PDB file of C-alpha atoms in Angstrom:
ATOM      1  CA  UNK A   4      20.059  45.879 -44.157  1.00 42.90           C
ATOM      2  CA  UNK A   5      18.433  43.687 -41.509  1.00 45.14           C
ATOM      3  CA  UNK A   6      14.929  44.033 -40.015  1.00 49.77           C
ATOM      4  CA  UNK A   7      13.306  42.421 -36.959  1.00 45.93           C
ATOM      5  CA  UNK A   8       9.711  41.537 -37.830  1.00 47.13           C
ATOM      6  CA  UNK A   9       6.615  39.544 -36.940  1.00 47.49           C
ATOM      7  CA  UNK A  10       3.927  38.584 -39.404  1.00 50.03           C
ATOM      8  CA  UNK A  11       0.375  37.927 -38.245  1.00 49.90           C
ATOM      9  CA  UNK A  12      -2.881  36.932 -39.887  1.00 50.75           C
ATOM     10  CA  UNK A  13      -5.895  34.705 -39.455  1.00 53.54           C
ATOM     11  CA  UNK A  14      -6.112  31.342 -41.251  1.00 51.52           C
ATOM     12  CA  UNK A  15      -6.731  31.861 -44.970  1.00 50.54           C
ATOM     13  CA  UNK A  16      -5.239  35.364 -45.029  1.00 49.95           C
ATOM     14  CA  UNK A  17      -2.282  34.316 -47.177  1.00 47.13           C
ATOM     15  CA  UNK A  18       0.380  34.841 -44.513  1.00 48.02           C
ATOM     16  CA  UNK A  19       2.579  32.078 -45.966  1.00 48.53           C
ATOM     17  CA  UNK A  20       2.707  33.452 -49.496  1.00 44.81           C
ATOM     18  CA  UNK A  21       3.441  36.965 -48.268  1.00 45.46           C
ATOM     19  CA  UNK A  22       6.227  35.687 -45.998  1.00 44.87           C
ATOM     20  CA  UNK A  23       7.963  34.068 -48.971  1.00 42.75           C
ATOM     21  CA  UNK A  24       7.649  37.294 -50.970  1.00 43.49           C
ATOM     22  CA  UNK A  25       9.021  39.282 -48.027  1.00 47.28           C
ATOM     23  CA  UNK A  26      12.071  37.011 -47.851  1.00 47.73           C
ATOM     24  CA  UNK A  27      12.739  37.349 -51.583  1.00 47.74           C
ATOM     25  CA  UNK A  28      12.721  41.151 -51.442  1.00 46.00           C
ATOM     26  CA  UNK A  29      14.212  41.856 -48.000  1.00 45.14           C
ATOM     27  CA  UNK A  30      16.296  38.695 -47.271  1.00 45.14           C
ATOM     28  CA  UNK A  31      15.128  38.347 -43.650  1.00 46.15           C
ATOM     29  CA  UNK A  32      15.092  34.835 -42.176  1.00 49.92           C
ATOM     30  CA  UNK A  33      11.531  33.523 -42.297  1.00 46.85           C
ATOM     31  CA  UNK A  34      10.916  31.662 -39.049  1.00 50.44           C
ATOM     32  CA  UNK A  35       7.702  29.723 -38.502  1.00 50.36           C
ATOM     33  CA  UNK A  36       6.998  27.683 -35.379  1.00 48.54           C
ATOM     34  CA  UNK A  37       7.386  24.517 -37.473  1.00 48.22           C
ATOM     35  CA  UNK A  38      10.701  25.671 -38.946  1.00 48.86           C
ATOM     36  CA  UNK A  39      12.081  26.507 -35.527  1.00 49.00           C
ATOM     37  CA  UNK A  40      11.231  23.154 -33.985  1.00 49.43           C
ATOM     38  CA  UNK A  41      12.269  21.184 -37.079  1.00 53.30           C
ATOM     39  CA  UNK A  42      15.622  23.000 -37.104  1.00 55.69           C
ATOM     40  CA  UNK A  43      16.272  22.429 -33.414  1.00 54.42           C
ATOM     41  CA  UNK A  44      15.510  18.724 -33.725  1.00 55.64           C
ATOM     42  CA  UNK A  45      17.058  17.977 -37.134  1.00 54.77           C
ATOM     43  CA  UNK A  46      20.189  19.948 -36.242  1.00 53.64           C
ATOM     44  CA  UNK A  47      20.128  18.287 -32.827  1.00 52.21           C
ATOM     45  CA  UNK A  48      20.578  21.385 -30.711  1.00 51.69           C
ATOM     46  CA  UNK A  49      20.422  21.161 -26.919  1.00 52.92           C
ATOM     47  CA  UNK A  50      16.837  22.439 -26.737  1.00 53.21           C
ATOM     48  CA  UNK A  51      15.870  20.446 -29.821  1.00 53.82           C
ATOM     49  CA  UNK A  52      16.885  17.066 -28.481  1.00 56.78           C
ATOM     50  CA  UNK A  53      15.120  18.077 -25.274  1.00 57.34           C
ATOM     51  CA  UNK A  54      11.946  18.989 -27.214  1.00 59.27           C
ATOM     52  CA  UNK A  55      12.193  15.714 -29.121  1.00 59.91           C
ATOM     53  CA  UNK A  56      11.996  13.708 -25.873  1.00 54.62           C
ATOM     54  CA  UNK A  57       8.458  15.037 -25.352  1.00 55.28           C
ATOM     55  CA  UNK A  58       7.355  14.960 -28.984  1.00 57.20           C
ATOM     56  CA  UNK A  59       8.513  11.347 -29.569  1.00 56.98           C
ATOM     57  CA  UNK A  60       6.430  10.350 -26.558  1.00 57.38           C
ATOM     58  CA  UNK A  61       3.398  12.202 -27.916  1.00 60.22           C
ATOM     59  CA  UNK A  62       3.515  14.637 -25.007  1.00 62.53           C
ATOM     60  CA  UNK A  63       3.115  18.425 -25.106  1.00 64.12           C
ATOM     61  CA  UNK A  64       6.198  20.626 -25.212  1.00 63.49           C
ATOM     62  CA  UNK A  65       6.416  22.690 -21.998  1.00 61.66           C
ATOM     63  CA  UNK A  66       6.515  26.502 -22.253  1.00 62.33           C
ATOM     64  CA  UNK A  67       9.975  26.569 -20.676  1.00 62.34           C
ATOM     65  CA  UNK A  68      11.297  24.368 -23.487  1.00 63.74           C
ATOM     66  CA  UNK A  69       9.528  26.339 -26.224  1.00 58.91           C
ATOM     67  CA  UNK A  70      10.976  29.582 -24.851  1.00 60.46           C
ATOM     68  CA  UNK A  71      14.463  28.062 -24.912  1.00 57.44           C
ATOM     69  CA  UNK A  72      13.895  26.920 -28.508  1.00 62.18           C
ATOM     70  CA  UNK A  73      13.004  30.500 -29.499  1.00 65.89           C
ATOM     71  CA  UNK A  74      15.914  32.110 -27.644  1.00 65.40           C
ATOM     72  CA  UNK A  75      18.236  29.547 -29.240  1.00 63.16           C
ATOM     73  CA  UNK A  76      16.882  30.344 -32.713  1.00 66.30           C
ATOM     74  CA  UNK A  77      17.137  34.118 -32.282  1.00 67.88           C
ATOM     75  CA  UNK A  78      20.656  33.563 -31.031  1.00 65.72           C
ATOM     76  CA  UNK A  79      21.776  32.225 -34.429  1.00 66.52           C
ATOM     77  CA  UNK A  80      24.132  34.078 -36.699  1.00 66.98           C
ATOM     78  CA  UNK A  81      21.615  34.683 -39.528  1.00 65.16           C
ATOM     79  CA  UNK A  82      19.503  36.747 -37.130  1.00 66.51           C
ATOM     80  CA  UNK A  83      22.314  39.307 -36.640  1.00 64.97           C
ATOM     81  CA  UNK A  84      23.070  39.413 -40.335  1.00 66.47           C
ATOM     82  CA  UNK A  85      19.681  39.503 -42.019  1.00 68.14           C
ATOM     83  CA  UNK A  86      17.072  40.006 -39.310  1.00 68.59           C
ATOM     84  CA  UNK A  87      13.960  37.865 -39.162  1.00 67.08           C
ATOM     85  CA  UNK A  88      10.287  37.365 -39.821  1.00 66.67           C
ATOM     86  CA  UNK A  89       8.710  35.405 -36.974  1.00 68.94           C
ATOM     87  CA  UNK A  90       5.545  33.549 -38.029  1.00 72.35           C
ATOM     88  CA  UNK A  91       3.119  31.782 -35.678  1.00 72.24           C
ATOM     89  CA  UNK A  92       4.997  32.688 -32.520  1.00 73.95           C
ATOM     90  CA  UNK A  93       3.960  34.286 -30.248  1.00 75.65           C
ATOM     91  CA  UNK A  94       0.573  32.528 -30.376  1.00 73.66           C
ATOM     92  CA  UNK A  95      -0.680  33.740 -26.981  1.00 73.45           C
ATOM     93  CA  UNK A  96      -0.163  36.877 -24.888  1.00 73.69           C
ATOM     94  CA  UNK A  97       1.926  34.827 -22.437  1.00 74.81           C
ATOM     95  CA  UNK A  98       4.270  33.880 -25.270  1.00 71.66           C
ATOM     96  CA  UNK A  99       4.390  37.541 -26.320  1.00 71.47           C
ATOM     97  CA  UNK A 100       5.587  38.417 -22.805  1.00 71.88           C
ATOM     98  CA  UNK A 101       8.149  35.610 -22.948  1.00 73.35           C
ATOM     99  CA  UNK A 102       9.342  36.758 -26.371  1.00 73.82           C
ATOM    100  CA  UNK A 103       9.782  40.361 -25.207  1.00 75.08           C
ATOM    101  CA  UNK A 104      11.890  39.100 -22.317  1.00 75.91           C
ATOM    102  CA  UNK A 105      14.047  37.055 -24.709  1.00 76.75           C
ATOM    103  CA  UNK A 106      14.452  39.975 -27.115  1.00 76.22           C
ATOM    104  CA  UNK A 107      15.452  42.234 -24.211  1.00 74.89           C
ATOM    105  CA  UNK A 108      17.974  39.633 -22.977  1.00 79.12           C
ATOM    106  CA  UNK A 109      19.435  39.361 -26.493  1.00 79.88           C
ATOM    107  CA  UNK A 110      19.555  43.144 -26.904  1.00 80.90           C
ATOM    108  CA  UNK A 111      17.200  42.898 -29.883  1.00 82.39           C
ATOM    109  CA  UNK A 112      14.322  45.245 -30.720  1.00 86.74           C
ATOM    110  CA  UNK A 113      11.234  44.408 -32.736  1.00 88.86           C
ATOM    111  CA  UNK A 114      10.947  46.976 -35.508  1.00 90.05           C
ATOM    112  CA  UNK A 115       7.608  46.102 -37.032  1.00 91.58           C
ATOM    113  CA  UNK A 116       4.638  43.791 -37.303  1.00 92.12           C
ATOM    114  CA  UNK A 117       2.824  43.014 -40.540  1.00 89.49           C
ATOM    115  CA  UNK A 118      -0.797  42.336 -39.659  1.00 86.72           C
ATOM    116  CA  UNK A 119      -2.763  41.037 -42.623  1.00 88.13           C
ATOM    117  CA  UNK A 120      -6.425  41.849 -42.062  1.00 83.79           C
ATOM    118  CA  UNK A 121      -9.252  39.995 -43.767  1.00 85.14           C
ATOM    119  CA  UNK A 122     -12.882  40.076 -42.717  1.00 80.96           C
ATOM    120  CA  UNK A 123     -13.660  36.851 -40.804  1.00 81.63           C
ATOM    121  CA  UNK A 124     -16.896  36.355 -42.782  1.00 83.56           C
ATOM    122  CA  UNK A 125     -14.885  36.480 -46.009  1.00 83.84           C
ATOM    123  CA  UNK A 126     -12.409  34.023 -44.479  1.00 83.59           C
ATOM    124  CA  UNK A 127     -15.220  31.708 -43.399  1.00 86.24           C
ATOM    125  CA  UNK A 128     -16.695  31.535 -46.906  1.00 85.31           C
ATOM    126  CA  UNK A 129     -13.237  31.019 -48.417  1.00 86.55           C
ATOM    127  CA  UNK A 130     -12.215  28.220 -46.038  1.00 85.02           C
ATOM    128  CA  UNK A 131     -15.523  26.346 -45.840  1.00 84.55           C
ATOM    129  CA  UNK A 132     -16.525  26.092 -49.490  1.00 85.75           C
ATOM    130  CA  UNK A 133     -14.776  22.895 -50.552  1.00 86.16           C
ATOM    131  CA  UNK A 134     -17.232  20.185 -51.565  1.00 91.62           C
ATOM    132  CA  UNK A 135     -16.370  16.645 -52.674  1.00 91.14           C
ATOM    133  CA  UNK A 136     -18.247  14.127 -54.830  1.00 91.18           C
ATOM    134  CA  UNK A 137     -18.864  10.734 -53.226  1.00 94.80           C
ATOM    135  CA  UNK A 138     -17.483   8.358 -55.862  1.00 93.49           C
ATOM    136  CA  UNK A 139     -15.639  10.542 -58.386  1.00 95.16           C
ATOM    137  CA  UNK A 140     -13.993  12.509 -55.580  1.00 94.90           C
ATOM    138  CA  UNK A 141     -14.093  15.638 -57.725  1.00 94.24           C
ATOM    139  CA  UNK A 142     -13.546  18.893 -55.827  1.00 93.68           C
ATOM    140  CA  UNK A 143     -15.698  22.042 -55.959  1.00 95.00           C
ATOM    141  CA  UNK A 144     -16.579  25.206 -54.054  1.00 96.82           C
ATOM    142  CA  UNK A 150     -19.280  26.029 -58.900  1.00 95.86           C
ATOM    143  CA  UNK A 151     -21.329  23.049 -60.111  1.00 96.90           C
ATOM    144  CA  UNK A 152     -23.229  21.325 -57.280  1.00 95.84           C
ATOM    145  CA  UNK A 153     -26.224  20.236 -59.336  1.00 93.75           C
ATOM    146  CA  UNK A 154     -27.119  17.779 -56.601  1.00 94.02           C
ATOM    147  CA  UNK A 155     -26.927  18.806 -52.943  1.00 91.48           C
ATOM    148  CA  UNK A 156     -26.810  15.240 -51.629  1.00 94.33           C
ATOM    149  CA  UNK A 157     -24.138  13.883 -53.983  1.00 97.57           C
ATOM    150  CA  UNK A 158     -21.417  15.751 -52.099  1.00 99.80           C
ATOM    151  CA  UNK A 159     -19.749  15.803 -48.688  1.00 97.96           C
ATOM    152  CA  UNK A 160     -17.298  18.023 -46.810  1.00 96.92           C
ATOM    153  CA  UNK A 161     -14.148  17.208 -44.869  1.00 97.13           C
ATOM    154  CA  UNK A 162     -14.672  17.824 -41.159  1.00 94.60           C
ATOM    155  CA  UNK A 163     -11.901  20.433 -41.397  1.00 92.72           C
ATOM    156  CA  UNK A 164     -13.912  22.311 -44.042  1.00 93.69           C
ATOM    157  CA  UNK A 165     -17.379  22.361 -42.485  1.00 91.24           C
ATOM    158  CA  UNK A 166     -18.666  25.893 -41.741  1.00 90.56           C
ATOM    159  CA  UNK A 167     -19.061  25.193 -38.010  1.00 92.47           C
ATOM    160  CA  UNK A 168     -15.504  23.895 -37.772  1.00 90.87           C
ATOM    161  CA  UNK A 169     -13.963  26.798 -39.673  1.00 89.25           C
ATOM    162  CA  UNK A 170     -16.080  29.244 -37.656  1.00 88.22           C
ATOM    163  CA  UNK A 171     -14.774  27.817 -34.374  1.00 89.20           C
ATOM    164  CA  UNK A 172     -11.198  27.870 -35.690  1.00 93.29           C
ATOM    165  CA  UNK A 173     -11.509  31.516 -36.707  1.00 93.22           C
ATOM    166  CA  UNK A 174     -13.155  32.518 -33.415  1.00 94.07           C
ATOM    167  CA  UNK A 175     -10.413  30.857 -31.354  1.00 93.01           C
ATOM    168  CA  UNK A 176      -7.681  32.436 -33.485  1.00 93.49           C
ATOM    169  CA  UNK A 177      -9.330  35.858 -33.162  1.00 90.97           C
ATOM    170  CA  UNK A 178      -9.658  35.593 -29.375  1.00 93.41           C
ATOM    171  CA  UNK A 179      -6.059  34.442 -28.937  1.00 92.23           C
ATOM    172  CA  UNK A 180      -4.611  37.008 -31.346  1.00 92.10           C
ATOM    173  CA  UNK A 181      -6.537  40.100 -30.178  1.00 91.93           C
ATOM    174  CA  UNK A 182      -4.588  40.784 -26.955  1.00 88.82           C
ATOM    175  CA  UNK A 183      -1.293  40.199 -28.794  1.00 87.15           C
ATOM    176  CA  UNK A 184      -2.138  42.712 -31.484  1.00 87.77           C
ATOM    177  CA  UNK A 185      -3.315  45.198 -28.835  1.00 88.46           C
ATOM    178  CA  UNK A 186      -0.139  44.617 -26.804  1.00 89.92           C
ATOM    179  CA  UNK A 187       2.121  45.650 -29.697  1.00 91.90           C
ATOM    180  CA  UNK A 188      -0.244  48.207 -31.265  1.00 92.74           C
ATOM    181  CA  UNK A 189      -0.046  50.143 -27.984  1.00 90.27           C
ATOM    182  CA  UNK A 190       3.670  50.472 -28.812  1.00 93.52           C
ATOM    183  CA  UNK A 191       3.095  51.492 -32.439  1.00 93.56           C
ATOM    184  CA  UNK A 192       4.638  48.337 -33.881  1.00 92.77           C
ATOM    185  CA  UNK A 193       1.563  47.079 -35.733  1.00 92.33           C
ATOM    186  CA  UNK A 194       0.885  47.837 -39.391  1.00 94.11           C
ATOM    187  CA  UNK A 195      -2.480  46.735 -40.734  1.00 94.47           C
ATOM    188  CA  UNK A 196      -2.428  45.447 -44.314  1.00 90.74           C
ATOM    189  CA  UNK A 197      -5.650  44.984 -46.258  1.00 91.69           C
ATOM    190  CA  UNK A 198      -5.544  41.338 -47.278  1.00 88.98           C
ATOM    191  CA  UNK A 199      -8.509  41.278 -49.658  1.00 87.51           C
ATOM    192  CA  UNK A 200      -6.394  42.184 -52.683  1.00 86.88           C
ATOM    193  CA  UNK A 201      -4.436  40.316 -55.341  1.00 86.08           C
ATOM    194  CA  UNK A 202      -1.268  38.702 -53.967  1.00 82.54           C
ATOM    195  CA  UNK A 203       0.962  41.294 -55.621  1.00 86.18           C
ATOM    196  CA  UNK A 204      -1.156  44.197 -54.342  1.00 87.62           C
ATOM    197  CA  UNK A 205      -1.102  42.936 -50.760  1.00 90.21           C
ATOM    198  CA  UNK A 206       2.668  42.622 -51.049  1.00 90.89           C
ATOM    199  CA  UNK A 207       2.831  46.072 -52.646  1.00 90.39           C
ATOM    200  CA  UNK A 208       1.377  47.620 -49.466  1.00 89.64           C
ATOM    201  CA  UNK A 209       3.687  45.484 -47.355  1.00 86.63           C
ATOM    202  CA  UNK A 210       6.681  46.684 -49.355  1.00 85.24           C
ATOM    203  CA  UNK A 211       5.738  50.313 -48.693  1.00 84.33           C
ATOM    204  CA  UNK A 212       5.498  49.677 -44.962  1.00 84.28           C
ATOM    205  CA  UNK A 213       8.805  47.831 -44.708  1.00 84.23           C
ATOM    206  CA  UNK A 214      10.876  50.228 -46.830  1.00 87.65           C
ATOM    207  CA  UNK A 215       9.652  53.130 -44.677  1.00 88.40           C
ATOM    208  CA  UNK A 216      10.607  51.568 -41.334  1.00 88.72           C
TER     209      UNK A 216
END
């Protein structure tokens, strides 16, 4: 009955799939950054219509507005009833500090953090393998009988993925340390089958 959770993991770690499995078993509200903003705007909340005025103009959403969005979301009814699984926020240590303030104001306590760990070299190989034929557009990872008959999306080039992973690691490290120092972080080995990863998650959550 109700749990207040964060889920964390580097790109390619399968955070999305696990979140959906967590919802199915434990009924917490899965809340990604995208969901939160889409809700605020589509449901036309006070913060949402405010956020929309920046987004429509192609401008960045200020921290003050983002923090209001979050507080608004965690203020909803479903949060009291079912708890939550916050996904993608906080993204920086500053947002972690802002979140803690909001949770304290709301009288809410974080109960656990699911941290899916996968070796960044394994992630790199998994995210930067996709290769595409020039005229048939056939996708690979596997074949390649001709090195020059293929190309990669910019998003999928090893240097691009490597930078993405490095930035995500650097931004996430102080957040993980911040909450680990409070015993809230539970490391899950992510290099398993989907059902085995979730199996370890299930053990953690039922024993909270």
